Write a protein that binds this ligand. Structure first.
Ligand SMILES: Nc1ncnc2c1ncn2[C@@H]1O[C@H](CSCC[C@H](N)C(=O)O)[C@@H](O)[C@H]1O
Ligand SMILES: [Zn+2]
Ligand SMILES: [Zn+2]
Lengths: 114, 298
């Protein structure tokens, strides 16, 4: 009945004042794109930056099992967009927020349905 | 004059036709550096200027291409050149990569070990390599031709590249080989290319365009490396990062080139003319399968 829970050892390490993870990979692009959250080629707008997907996932980078009956990664092989005032900790941003299943924007930072 | 607004500089045709002897390399810059945009790494900017120069030549591009990449890991544990190659190529293309130490990546499949344990069953349309060892540079003994991983590379090309395909392979002052210069005479054209962001070093990339399977001219490889050191010692180059700011025309164009299978006695002068202009590929079209060898004594 025992198993380890690493999503919560990172959240408590930051709350006491540790240094965030480094060496995530950033790309060159036009900055006149669409604005959505996860895509097959880069799509940042005037208020965003774009990164390669494997280097921003906590399970891939620590060498452990993905939390799923059939290990499946949502990020490896694609591109992800981040707001410019949070770009010093990209691993922490993705672990805490959620995507809208109707328009494709981040909830809190773009979606305008409700 | 207007050289500072291009992505780099190539070797002119009249330096290839001389007969010189070998000397030491000594450059006028060296300890100068360029100014990079905010937060960008040195190896992302180097792979972007190489793909912008290949867009000006006559390459073949079919439905369902195949590509392979050697020497792709780093001392940080990730892979920056593999993420630039997947932004450039069309959607649907298959890609495979490899190294001697462990790392994490965005490709469809990956293998770990020394390059001489790798085997495959099908053929390929394009090949890229960045392998290097730093114990080669010593200024206290004589400078001779080298073996090692260069012996495996000359044999893979003659056995598993398709008729009509292309290559690009990295070198320096002390890391080089004499039969690789002699095999550049079995393609329809060849050159050597230097990037504008790393122009205070002796690095370059050796390129061959549209493959024919037999010799078209004869070349002596000890005399041609000494002609390359004479050019760099008498022509200095200015450092620049201007071309990284305009990306509105970067992606590679889809041509739809055609594919056939044929036997060794059906190749006539009509066929040979079509291969020379970038309009035909010859191979089979089955499935893809690969593997790696393991030794037991533990
Ligand atoms: N015999 C051999 N087999 C496989 N890889 C080799 C090799 N000799 C050298 N190499 C590899 O060649 C590499 C040179 S540095 C590569 C940097 C990388 N391309 C980047 O995108 O940043 C090293 O990782 C080294 O391990
Ligand atoms: Zn993952
Ligand atoms: Zn919505």
């Amino acid at each position: 009945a025992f198993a380890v829970d690493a999503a919560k050892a990172y959240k408590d390490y930051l709350a006491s004042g540790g240094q965030p993870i480094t060496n995530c990979v950033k790309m060159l692009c036009t900055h006149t794109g669409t604005g959505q959250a996860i895509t097959v080629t880069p799509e940042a707008n005037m208020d965003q930056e774009s990164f390669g997907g494997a280097s921003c996932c906590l399970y891939c980078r620590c060498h452990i099992d993905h939390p799923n009956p059939k290990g499946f990664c949502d990020l490896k092989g694609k591109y992800v967009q981040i707001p410019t005032t949070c770009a010093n900790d990209p691993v922490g941003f993705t672990l805490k927020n959620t995507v809208c299943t109707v328009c494709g924007m981040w909830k809190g930072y773009g979606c305008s349905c409700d | 004059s207007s050289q500072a607004w291009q992505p780099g500089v190539a070797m002119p045709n009249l330096y290839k036709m001389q007969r010189m002897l070998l000397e030491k390399c000594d450059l006028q810059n060296y300890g100068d550096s360029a100014t990079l945009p905010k937060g960008i790494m040195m190896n992302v900017a180097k792979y972007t200027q190489l793909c912008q120069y290949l867009n000006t030549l006559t390459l073949a591009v079919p439905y369902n291409m195949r590509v392979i990449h050697f020497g792709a890991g780093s001392d940080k544990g990730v892979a920056p050149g593999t993420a630039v190659l997947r932004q450039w190529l069309p959607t649907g293309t298959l890609l495979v990569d490899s190294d001697l130490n462990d790392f994490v990546s965005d490709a469809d499949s990956t293998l770990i070990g020394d390059c001489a344990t790798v085997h495959t069953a099908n053929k390929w349309d394009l090949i890229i390599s960045d392998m290097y060892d730093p114990k080669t540079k010593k200024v206290t003994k004589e400078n001779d031709s080298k073996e090692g991983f260069f012996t495996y590379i000359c044999g893979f090309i003659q056995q598993k590249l398709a008729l009509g395909g292309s290559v690009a392979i990295k070198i320096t002052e002390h890391s080089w080989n004499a039969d690789l210069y002699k095999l550049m005479g079995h393609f329809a054209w060849w050159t050597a290319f230097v990037t504008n962001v790393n122009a205070s070093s002796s690095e370059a990339f050796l390129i061959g365009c549209n493959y024919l399977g037999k010799p078209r001219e004869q070349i002596d490889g000890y005399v041609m490396h000494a002609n390359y050191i004479f050019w760099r010692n008498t022509n200095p180059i200015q450092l620049s990062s201007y071309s990284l700011f305009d990306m509105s025309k970067f992606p590679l164009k889809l041509r739809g080139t055609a594919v056939m299978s044929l036997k060794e006695g059906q190749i006539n002068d009509m066929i040979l003319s079509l291969l020379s202009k970038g309009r035909l590929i010859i191979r089979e079209n089955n499935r893809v399968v690969i593997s790696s060898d393991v030794l037991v004594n533990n």
